[PDB]
């Protein structure tokens, strides 16, 4: 209630200050990640009729998630929210999916930076996870990748590829493609990457950025497999 009453209508200074209060106070709570997923689902829904500055409060959400990344519940609850969100790819909410995949992408880049201080995905910025739910959300992300048509766009494709590679490399052990895709799905991905049914002319599938992101995701999952 304090988050929904202060960060929505308050000034940016008191918004940032009360977010800092919430992470320095209830950052280590066991329900913090569930609260973050709940406020994400109840603020950025496609049916949400509230007029609020989504971008700045999303930046605040990214800041407080990067603060609470020491807690292990935020990433688990956000990936569970993803798993619930693209469940119809076993309707689809493309904007909310985009919001949450960029949020978890920022959190996973902070995780990668922490692991570095204690590179293939640097063209965007200029902990231990359970195996089964990670496998489920990864294969659902791949099925979202394969079901991308003219309604879906290329930046979302880049970000789902990036977060797919990051979740595949973050889980212990690293998820391999055998439990990710079967033969038709991998054949569709390969023919989408190199076949001339989608790579004809200067408007090859998703553009060169999407081709590079797909290649980098496959290379990252392969390198995680052969470690």
């Amino acid at each position: 209630e304090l988050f929904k009453h202060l960060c929505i209508s308050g000034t940016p200074k008191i918004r940032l200050h009360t977010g800092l209060l919430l992470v320095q106070l209830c950052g280590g709570e066991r329900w913090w990640g569930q609260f973050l997923s709940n406020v994400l689902q109840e603020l950025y829904n496609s049916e949400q009729l509230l007029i609020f500055p989504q971008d700045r409060v999303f930046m605040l959400l990214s800041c407080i998630g990067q603060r609470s990344l020491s807690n292990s519940g935020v990433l688990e609850s956000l990936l569970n929210l993803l798993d619930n969100l693209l469940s119809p790819l076993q309707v689809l909410d493309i904007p909310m999916i985009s919001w949450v995949v960029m949020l978890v992408s920022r959190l996973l880049d902070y995780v990668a930076t922490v692991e570095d201080e204690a590179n293939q995905w640097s063209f965007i910025n200029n902990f231990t996870l359970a195996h089964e739910r990670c496998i489920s959300v990864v294969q659902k992300l791949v099925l979202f990748l394969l079901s991308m048509d003219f309604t879906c766009h290329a930046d979302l494709l880049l970000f789902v590829c990036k977060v797919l590679a990051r979740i595949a490399n973050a889980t212990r052990p690293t998820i391999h493609l055998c439990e990710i895709v079967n033969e038709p799905q991998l054949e569709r991905l390969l023919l989408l990457l190199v076949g001339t049914d989608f790579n004809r002319g200067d408007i090859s599938w998703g553009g060169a950025w999407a081709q590079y992101s797909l290649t980098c995701m496959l290379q990252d999952i392969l390198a995680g497999e052969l470690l």
């Binding site: 391999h176 493609l177 991998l186 076949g195």
Partner: peptide, 14 residues
């Protein structure tokens, strides 16, 4: 549980 044989199958198919 290596995905190398399925990659070989798909690349030979291509």
């Amino acid at each position: 549980l290596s995905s190398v044989p399925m990659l070989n199958v798909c690349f030979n198919k291509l």
